[PDB]
Amino acid sequence: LDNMRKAGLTDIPKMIQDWLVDCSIEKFPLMAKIYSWSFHVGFRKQKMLDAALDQLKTEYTEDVDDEMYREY
């Protein structure tokens, strides 16, 4: 929520903040409503390259177990 406010969001942290006082499921559909209001803003149609590099970052190490990989 602090990152949420740091981006410039005021009302929607407040709706997520005042709900935690009760954590009730009757007021909860708001969250679900909010959870759907996020996906009606569009696609992040960035470039093939930079979108691949979300995946193509690797940290391969000779410190893992072998007892684990062999069982796997």
Binding site: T58, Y60, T61, E62, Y69, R70
Partner: protein
């Protein structure tokens, strides 16, 4: 990207029809352990022939 090299043991198998029977041993040279050799010799008093 230097990928690590995970090597299993892999336990190389066969099946019965693919078991080769045997190959007989015919003999090579006669399996020596010893050989002769010229050495010098020294008579008593120590000196040499």
């Amino acid at each position: 990207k230097t990928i690590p090299t995970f090597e299993p043991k892999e336990s190389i198998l066969k099946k019965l029809e693919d078991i080769k029977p045997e190959q007989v041993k015919k003999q090579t040279k006669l399996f020596r352990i010893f050989e002769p050799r010229q050495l010098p010799v020294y008579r008593a008093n120590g000196e040499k022939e």
